């Protein structure tokens, strides 16, 4: 059922957990570094878990997709063929920016954080800077122990702060991926949909130095020996059975003003969806004719597809439940309730007015702000601006450097510059530059940027072509040239004739000004947001509703039971799918082109010892009433005894609007059954070495 519960809320969900069928003790789940919770790890935007004492990690294929793609070429395309390392020495690097974060410690720093903010006084920009300085110092201190990366989280609009410390594993390797037609069976047609028949799994191995301590990739590294790892269920999961997930959901907006919902539904989602679908169309068309573009842009395209479809589904779910009307009426109820409390309601009413003004300020420049950010996110302009900004930050003392540009960020910056080599083709990026130039040019005069207008020197198709031809002279297309500029100083950027560098130098003062506006608004938000959101929490509790913070990339638990849902009268979706449903969808054309060994094995009824007699087949995917969102992909699903019964990977179509208004009847998790992972690894794309390592072969 509903709720992305923080670990600190275990006392309040202990009852409900038991009633839903958890047979582990709650104290046993309270130990975040114990068995089984200490097996659960963050990947940075996905979740994973250890499944062996020798550092084997299981996550979704969608989570490993970037890594698989980094190791793919048009000639040897692992997205298409799968990957399998018969021995650990055959594992390939997942990329310099791949990470496994292992939870070490959580600390409440709410009192200190809020005192740092208060000490800033009246000024909005100082208030941002005070919190930043607080955060940097705290993190520096936490990260004094080598091998650890720390993160400060704000919950419930700034009403609580906790610091997380994680062991940061920095040499993550790909151990196994099923073929794409298993890992992403049904592609974007079945994305966000049930019935689902997708084997969405892959494995990494975590590596450390011979001294036990995290290190970047080296042939001298050895597998990490985790303290805890998960075991596969020995009991067959069935309909109605208890399941729980622990993971790292990214963001939800269930506490939001009506107007923030309205702007998102009316402007933000449709705008992004359109821009993404436009770029998908260009890249798809180009990749049809160029297999190198197809493979190099596959991960970006997966992202654009997944997001745009998610947004389409949100817009549709808003209309289905009247989200606009729900938000309007809830807000009128909270505002009435506050007005009813006389004096002591006033600070929240005032906060609400301030929040609404800050939203309006945002809105006045939204087209400009989005368009410029996304133009600057093409590969060469993104490289140029990031590296020119680093050269500026490098002249300040480290503690004063912008977050993202401190010494502790240098590995990521550098690794990103290298990864891009497998994700850039000039003739493709040019078309993307051109798209964004044409969108920039449609902005009205009051949403234009002087710097970009001057640089363009014109407002028509000719000026666009002349600018593209100028940018094509960049030398940032090569990894070595980017790394040169990664180390160069500010003066070297300002003397350069590279046309992408010249763009960056020309626009940088404008980006820096926009950033200060954003920091200023954020500082006002620091004042207003916690007061209003506490009012919202207090009102929800007076209504007897569940109270838990919006997602914010920190660890949460959700729990419930295996069950289907009813999308309309006269029909029900069943909780499971089966092997014969996979074959029934076969067309022999992407995305419905399963491996021939799959089609053979199902035809021969080779169930591999994994049949669930209650469904007459091996289960493939299942529905449950858990509350998950983006960032939960890869989260283990545990049964009543804390055994692995699947991985979380998607939501059904009607669920996605729950980011803004929670609908219990149509909100489900889609997970891939542990038995299907094992079945694929036995009958279809064999990995007997891994099955043995996990004690299931």
């Amino acid at each position: 059922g509903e709720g992305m519960w923080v670990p600190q809320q275990l006392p309040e969900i202990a009852g409900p957990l038991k009633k839903a069928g958890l047979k582990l003790s709650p104290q046993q789940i309270s130990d975040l570094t114990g068995d089984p919770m200490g097996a659960v790890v963050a990947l940075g935007g996905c979740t994973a878990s250890f499944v062996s004492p020798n550092g084997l990690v299981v996550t979704n294929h969608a989570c490993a997709y970037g890594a698989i793609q980094l190791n793919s070429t048009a000639e040897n395309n692992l997205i298409k063929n799968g990957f399998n390392a018969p021995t650990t020495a055959d594992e390939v690097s997942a990329g310099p920016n791949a990470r496994v974060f292992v939870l070490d410690e959580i600390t409440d720093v709410t009192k200190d954080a809020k005192a740092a903010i208060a000490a800033a006084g009246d000024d909005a920009l100082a208030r941002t800077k005070a919190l930043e300085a607080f955060e940097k110092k705290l993190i520096a201190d936490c990260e004094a122990e080598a091998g650890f990366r720390c993160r400060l989280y704000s919950f419930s609009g700034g009403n609580t702060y906790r610091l997380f410390k994680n062991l940061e594993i920095k040499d993550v390797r790909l151990a196994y991926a099923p073929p794409g037609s298993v890992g992403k069976f049904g592609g974007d047609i079945d994305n966000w949909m049930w019935p689902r028949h997708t084997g969405d799994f892959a494995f990494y191995r975590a590596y450390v130095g011979k001294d036990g301590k995290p290190a970047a990739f080296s042939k001298d590294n050895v597998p990490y020996q985790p303290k805890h790892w998960l075991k596969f269920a020995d009991q067959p999961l069935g309909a109605g059975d208890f399941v729980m997930v622990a993971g790292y959901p990214g963001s939800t907006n269930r506490y939001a003003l009506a107007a923030e919902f309205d702007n998102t539904a009316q402007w933000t989602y449709p705008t992004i969806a359109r821009h993404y679908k436009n770029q998908i169309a260009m890249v798809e068309a180009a990749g049809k004719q160029n297999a190198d573009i197809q493979v190099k842009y596959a991960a970006t395209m997966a992202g654009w597809n997944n997001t745009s479809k998610n947004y389409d589904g949100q817009l549709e779910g808003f209309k289905r439940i009247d989200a606009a009307g729900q938000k309007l009426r809830e807000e009128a109820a909270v505002l009435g309730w506050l007005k009813g409390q006389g004096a002591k309601g006033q600070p929240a009413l005032d906060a609400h007015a301030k929040l609404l003004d800050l939203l309006e300020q945002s809105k006045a420049t939204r087209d400009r702000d989005l368009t410029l950010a996304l133009f600057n996110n093409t590969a060469m302009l993104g490289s140029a601006t990031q590296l020119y900004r680093l050269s500026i930050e490098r002249e300040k003392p480290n503690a004063e450097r912008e977050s993202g540009y401190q010494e502790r960020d240098l590995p990521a910056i550098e690794g990103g510059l290298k990864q891009l080599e497998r994700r850039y083709v000039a003739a493709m990026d040019r078309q993307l530059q051109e798209y964004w130039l044409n969108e920039y040019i449609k902005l009205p005069a009051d949403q234009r940027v002087a710097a970009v207008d001057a640089w363009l020197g014109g407002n028509d198709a000719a000026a666009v072509k002349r600018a593209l031809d100028r940018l094509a002279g960049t030398k940032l297309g090569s990894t070595e040239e980017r790394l040169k500029w990664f180390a160069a100083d500010r003066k070297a950027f300002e003397a350069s004739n590279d046309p992408a560098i010249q763009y960056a130098v020309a626009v940088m003062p404008t980006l820096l000004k926009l950033e200060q506006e954003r920091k200023t608004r954020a500082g006002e938000n620091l004042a207003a947001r916690p007061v209003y959101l506490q009012a919202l929490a207090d009102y929800k509790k007076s209504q007897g509703e569940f109270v838990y913070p919006d997602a914010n990339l920190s660890l949460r638990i959700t729990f419930g039971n295996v069950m289907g849902y009813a999308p309309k009268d006269g029909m029900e979706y069943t909780p499971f799918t089966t092997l014969e449903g996979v074959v029934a969808k076969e067309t022999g054309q992407d995305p419905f082109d399963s491996p021939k060994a799959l089609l053979d094995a199902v035809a021969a009824k080779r169930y591999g010892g994994l049949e669930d007699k209650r469904i007459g087949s091996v289960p493939v995917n299942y529905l449950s009433d858990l509350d998950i969102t983006g960032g939960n992909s890869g989260s283990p699903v545990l049964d009543a005894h804390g055994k692995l019964v699947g991985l979380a990977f998607d939501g059904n179509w009607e669920s996605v609007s729950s980011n803004w208004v929670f609908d219990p009847k149509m909100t489900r998790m889609i997970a891939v059954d542990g038995r299907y992972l094992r079945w694929i690894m036995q009958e279809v794309y064999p990995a007997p070495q891994l099955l043995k390592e996990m004690n299931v072969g």
Partner: peptide, 5 residues
């Protein structure tokens, strides 16, 4: 898919 965009 519930990856984080």
């Amino acid at each position: 898919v519930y990856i984080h965009p």
